[PDB]
């Protein structure tokens, strides 16, 4: 949903690991089986991700993604709920901002001293702001390929000197602009302590069925002669299905003071079919314009490697490497380096902090994700 630099400052500080490593309450969103690693009691977590991006040769500004968690740990069970947000933008510009708020309902169980199982069911709210410029040639290539339809086509081609159509659907540029939808996702994982120092973990993340995103949009016809004629109406996006993913990984704790974790993850873009329809209906007339953009993606592999050193009773230090690349059934991979630390102000109060620098690819893409969280733990153990 994000970009697996991980979930929370402990995972992100270690390059994205978490299939077998106790990343805290964020395990709800990675491998919920790891929640059995948390101490008994009640855990409240507050944090956010602060993403600033830069692109050499679309807002760079600080994106803020908050995370809330409540986890109960007693005996063999863990129960959790939270709210995990992601924010970011892709690319009269062509752009898409995607907001995903995932609200897990999570549980985990120690089957025995070696085997832990866990699952989450997400309620998922997806929101997209977008702008899409289509010139006269592109409309043509797409009208002859049977990809544009709707009674708005002939009236638009008859705009004098028509140069481009602009689909705008943005909360920030017009009130109620954008589209949104509630949906459902989830994950099912386990951990296995096969060796006293080596734990292995596996989690399958389900395909998120987001369902039809609806809302408001403007379609502006651009003409040097006739001005920019905006038409207002309803917009519907059709077939989204965030892809399933499989994460397998291992944690090795040479001592309580020093651990290393490594994870491998396959994201299954190829099994998301592509019927991605875009329909706009003009609110005065009921005249519509229909549009397909079936864009296929290939599977992605991600490798995550990090380490953690407990220094004294209050300080923990982390570092990690992250490598994402298209999959085996020619592309530049994305690499990221990370570091982080934790401070415990008390047995009940811990601050975690994370910094990750990523790079992709004539295009250069630089991205810094700052991650900070606070956990307040009230213990119980009877």
Numbering used by the authors: 3 to 59, 75 to 108, 127 to 364, 373 to 404, 419 to 439
Paper passage:
Thus far, only the FadL OM channel family has been shown to mediate transport of hydrophobics. PpF1 has three FadL orthologs, of which TodX (Pput_2883) and CymD (Pput_2901) are located in the adjacent tod and cym/cmt operons respectively. Here we show, by using an integrated approach combining growth assays, X-ray crystallography and molecular dynamics (MD) simulations, that MAH uptake as the first step in biodegradation does occur via lateral diffusion. In the presence of TodX/CymD, robust growth is observed, providing the first direct evidence for MAH transport by FadL-type channels.
